[PDB]
Design a protein around this ligand. Structure first.
Ligand SMILES: [Zn+2]
Ligand SMILES: [Zn+2]
Ligand SMILES: [Zn+2]
Ligand SMILES: [Zn+2]
Lengths: 77, 84
DNA sequence: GGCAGAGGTCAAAGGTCA
DNA sequence: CTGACCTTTGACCTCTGC
């Protein structure tokens, strides 16, 4: 075995874009990069990413994807 | 393929929170659970719930949502940071 | 062959606002 | 508050190039 997502802590499906991650953070990363979305944090860019609340701040979720080694260049068309 | 809200009998849009429901009963259940709304029935707590009378009693509508198998645990956290 | 890590889909969750 | 109308999520897939 059981690996956990380095982004939100949910059970990871395997490595995606360079990081051990859940289907959730994988899909969120892909769509964020495809559609060239930087988001905006409505609270000081210190939001906690966990399984149950990871959808609260898109900006802090993308920030943690990149901090944890997800690679924009591994997302293709 | 036309199916029907197990709560009010309006035309359903799909499963919502574990029951075949219309957009109204879906939106109502979310709002209710999200804000911890319990209601008060103004008449004996067995108000009839259908398309025409669904807004007559919030308490009997929510109670009927639960009876038909809508799950509060299926309602997620609001998608904003806490106190924003 | 084998399978990791890329792809895709759409039911059911979200949110919006006359 | 309601609900018609809209967007995003993520579990379950398939494809493929080492
Ligand atoms: Zn994750
Ligand atoms: Zn944030
Ligand atoms: Zn209904
Ligand atoms: Zn009542």
């Amino acid at each position: 075995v059981v690996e956990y997502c380095v982004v939100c802590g949910d059970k990871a499906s395997g490595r995606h874009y360079g990081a051990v991650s859940c289907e959730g953070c994988k899909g969120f990363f892909k769509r964020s990069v495809r559609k060239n979305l930087t988001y905006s944090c409505r609270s000081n860019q210190d939001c906690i990413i966990n399984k149950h609340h990871r959808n609260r701040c898109q900006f802090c979720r993308l920030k943690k994807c990149l901090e944890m080694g997800m690679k924009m260049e591994s997302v293709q068309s």
